[PDB]
Each structure stands twice: as C-alpha cells, then as structure tokens.
Symmetry: C5
Subunit: 86 residues, 5 copies
Amino acid sequence: SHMPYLLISTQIRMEVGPTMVGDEQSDPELMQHLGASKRRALGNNFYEYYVDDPPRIVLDKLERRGFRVLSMTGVGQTLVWCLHKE
Amino acid sequence: PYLLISTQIRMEVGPTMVGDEQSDPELMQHLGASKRRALGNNFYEYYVDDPPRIVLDKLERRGFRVLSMTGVGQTLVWCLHKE
Amino acid sequence: PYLLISTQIRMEVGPTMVGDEQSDPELMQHLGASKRRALGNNFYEYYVDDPPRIVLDKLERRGFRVLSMTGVGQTLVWCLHKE
Amino acid sequence: PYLLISTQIRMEVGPTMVGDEQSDPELMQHLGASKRRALGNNFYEYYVDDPPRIVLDKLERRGFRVLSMTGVGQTLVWCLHKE
Amino acid sequence: SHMPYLLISTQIRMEVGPTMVGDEQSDPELMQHLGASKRRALGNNFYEYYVDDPPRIVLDKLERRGFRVLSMTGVGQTLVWCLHKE
Ligand SMILES: [K+]
Ligand SMILES: [K+]
Ligand SMILES: [K+]
Ligand SMILES: [K+]
Ligand SMILES: [K+]
C-alpha cells in the first residue's frame, strides 16, 4: 500500500546503480513502476527492492510520482536520500 | 517540538531508537515503543522493532516533519519538527 | 542570528556544546550553560548537561529553527538560525 | 529535474563531476562538461575542471536550487532540484 | 561581484577558526568585508581566502549580506556550510 516516506540508496560511485528503492513493506505498484527487482541479500531475512539505474534517474521518476527529497546523507560508503510525498 | 530518531545500517530494518528518558510517554506509547537500559548506560532509551520508514510515517500522522537526516559512524539519524 | 550546537554519540545524552568564547552571554545563561576549557585549547567553550533535544526545544522558544544537522567524526552538529 | 554533482576535497578546486551517462546533453554542454570513462568503469561520466561553487552558480541560472549537501568518503555531494 | 552560492568550512573544533571563506574566483569585496586574507596550503597551487574567526561569526556576517545556510555537512574532519544569496 501507499507510503508517504521513501528511503533510497546507492553506494559510491553515485553515477551508477544499483539503487536500493525499497524494503519488504514497500508499495509493490510503486516498485513495479520503477522497474525494480526483489531479492534477499545473503544473511538477511528480509527482501529488498533495487533497480539498475543510478539515483538521479530514480529521483526524477519519484518526482513525477509526487515525491520530494527532504534530505540526503552519506554513511559508510553509501549515499541515502529521504523522500516525502508532497 | 523536536524529535531525534536513529537506526544503524541497514536502513531497511529496525530497531529504531525513538526517544531518550524525558520523551513524551504518550507519543512513545503511540509508536509501540519499549523502554530499556543498554549495558553501561544509566539512562533508559525508547525503541521499536520497526524500520525508520515505518516510524517516519507514524510521526507524520502526529504532525512531525523530517527537517534533516545525517550519518554518523554506522548510524542514520533523523531530526523531526512538529509543525 | 546563527547558532551551532553539538553532542557526541549517544545523541540521547549530554553534554551538549552550546557556544564558543564569543557567544551571547545572556543566551548561554538562559540555557544554564557552564564554561570549561579542554586541555589543549586556549579558548573557553559553553556546555550544558542536557541532551541536544532539550537544548533544541529551549532554542525554539528563543525563536531559533534548525536549518541543518550533520555528523563529523563521532559528533552530531545542529545549525540553527533565528527566524 | 534532480541533479547530483560532486567533488573530492579540497572543495575549492575541481574537477567537479556533473553527470552520469544518461544526463541531459544540453545541460552538460551548458556547463562546458567533457565526457570520459574512468579506468575500470563501464560507464561514462561528465565532469568540468571548475570547482563546485562555479558549477552551482551556473545551475542556479537554469532554475536549480541546492536541497542538500553531504560528505561520503572524501567526496562532497550536492543534490539540486529545479524549482 | 555576484556570488549566488558560497562554501565556507572549518576543521573540528567548530568553535575555533580558521574558517575557509573563499576560492581564487571569490568576490574580493565580500572577502575584504569578512576581513579575510589569502593563504596557500603547501600541496595546492591555488590560494584560498580565510579568516581567524570561528564559523558562527562568519555565518552572522554573511546573514547581514543576504546569505542563508541551505546545508551543512561533515567530510573527513571538516564541517562545510553551503550558503545562497536570498
Ligand atoms: K552507486
Ligand atoms: K537499521
Ligand atoms: K551525546
Ligand atoms: K575538489
Ligand atoms: K575549527
């Protein structure tokens, strides 16, 4: 179902994918719209959604869906974007 | 009016820290938070098993908005404001 | 009009650095801040025992708003502006 | 209408990375960017020799505004939005 | 003279200078207004503008000149502020 907050991420380089676009409880229709695939990384008990696109492409698709970036941060070697439906 | 929440990577999974000892008990109860004292700390912390995206959606319904998100060590922190 | 405050992890516990040597003495007194000097520093700093969420709430009452929050090393820093 | 640009420290000197392989060729041309494939990468990147402050000013003239700036590794990244 | 964006920085501690306030192409009048001087770090072939003031002092001076902080970030042991003339 619809969720107003989204978290997306990519590891450096920022210009290339994959971009993580969702967790197990993400909107399946939105994940399908992004062209995302579902997988379970080694050691995780949860599925994650990801796309081969770089984050700029994902951000533009999310903008057309009504999402806006509220914040971006780095942690480890990962860039994370926090978006909100507004 | 201000809230600080956090999770360690992975961002898609909990636990999420949702409060310090002086947090509003009613808001903590609304989030379904548990209270615990980590080893070595003399203060209680409120936490939930939910990932941060779930907590952010619950706080949005309570009038909070994310002002900023940052990384420190291996932790992601969100600063929210009631407005 | 600008303020910089900080705390080291854990974010839920103090001390919180609330000023440099040239900070507004009246605002530092209002926050209940004390002066201290780190061993290798030739300057005084203002600090409170409160965690940063408590300081942020006191600063909102004085007309300050968080514009940005970031991590550096093991420190969380907030940049506030009086609006 | 989002953009991501970056530079490694020092922030006062280029090169500034201004685009990925699928970036708007007109905007890349407006920035005076060159296209190259770094050693070991299968993708092309757009870059300029200018420091990021110069790039930010050029993007401002095309209606872009910085929403966020962050550090990761030894890289500074800016996220801009056409607004 | 028109500087839509500014980048300033200091290394920790944030309560003490020097604060880097410009690159070689910065407006000399704004640099003079801040009381900035030029310096060259050993490894750089370019000069930078700096002040002995901590960043809070610089932010207040820039606020009086029409600048507003849009973002602040840490990278390595440096704090950087991105300001926009608005
Ligand atoms: K990437
Ligand atoms: K987590
Ligand atoms: K602390
Ligand atoms: K650079
Ligand atoms: K400093």
